[PDB]
Symmetry: C2
Subunit: 196 residues, 2 copies
């Protein structure tokens, strides 16, 4: 009565909707908004920023980050050097620009030279094996995209309360989901699905 | 009747108030919130994140950044490797943690090993000579703190509209300033003060 069945959630994700993702069923878990990187529009990015910490990250597989030449920032942490898609952006931080950069990181035709580093988007490297190897939200994002038949790339950010800036716990996430019509799932629930 | 005189603005800044900073008087400029890094509280950081892009940066002098061992992210906005103050933080992204990290970057007693890298705060390296060398908002932040007799460190973020996520131009900044009782100034105005 709280979490959406994985198959229904994947269809929403495939259709470009956000999903509120918790670690498991615990009431104290803090929720993050996650959606397909290739489908995030200017409006959807504006929505993500409006209700989150604004530290917008783009989970990518290690293989993809390597192809785009996005090495770890230091030669859930595991950050790579930041970046902005060159053509089509100006300040890089605008909703339009961050959305464009995010979609570009997912686009198979994108090339390393297409990006400016540093930038305003924080790509994240998901470990091989995804959720079966590490139950991080980074792995969850790439796992969702993969299950949805999309490019192995997602975009995420922490939900925050407008009243005091505190991260949204389960109760507040449930409220947020009903108000905005966003389905909620948890990683434990997702791991069980992919495992059996 | 729009921009506050620099001396009055400095007193507000000195008292821990935010300042809305524009490049010059042009109505098309986008405004950023800037305040002293050492005075940013949990509440003020929550406020900053609530009305901004959330890509919160912490301008520091190149000399201070070197002392804290925060080298440029890559070897233009001079981003350093990101960081989180270790003791007292958990997720690093919370308003409490980001404010603590920001105050710590300003604290002259802080040491290189006190921070974890990468992190959730984006330090920026202000060029020597500040606004007399480069008119960036980074230099402006450090210049404001210096003129206020505070540590050469500031914290900034871009104001964004709640309706569509577009950055606030002058008109919206004036409305924002009056609604929250925040003074507005511009760089050209500041350079003139420090000159002559």
């Amino acid at each position: 009565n709280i979490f959406t069945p994985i198959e229904e959630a994947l269809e929403a994700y495939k259709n470009g909707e956000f999903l509120i993702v918790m670690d498991d069923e615990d009431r104290e878990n803090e929720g993050d908004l996650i959606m397909a990187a290739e489908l995030i529009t200017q409006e959807k990015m504006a929505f993500l920023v409006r209700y989150s910490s604004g530290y917008v990250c783009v989970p990518l597989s290690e293989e993809r980050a390597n192809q785009l030449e996005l090495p770890p920032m230091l030669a859930g942490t595991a950050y790579t050097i930041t970046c902005d898609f060159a053509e089509g952006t100006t300040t890089g931080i605008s909703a339009h620009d961050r959305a464009l950069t995010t979609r570009s990181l997912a686009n198979p035709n994108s090339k390393p030279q297409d990006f400016i580093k540093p930038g305003h988007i924080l790509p994240l490297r998901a470990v091989p094996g995804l959720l079966k190897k590490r139950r991080g939200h980074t792995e969850a994002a790439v796992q969702l995209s993969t299950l949805a038949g999309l490019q192995p790339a997602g975009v995420i950010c922490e939900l925050v309360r407008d009243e005091d800036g505190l991260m949204m716990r389960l109760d507040d996430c449930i409220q947020f989901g009903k108000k905005h019509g966003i389905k909620i799932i948890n990683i434990n629930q997702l791991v069980e699905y992919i495992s059996k």
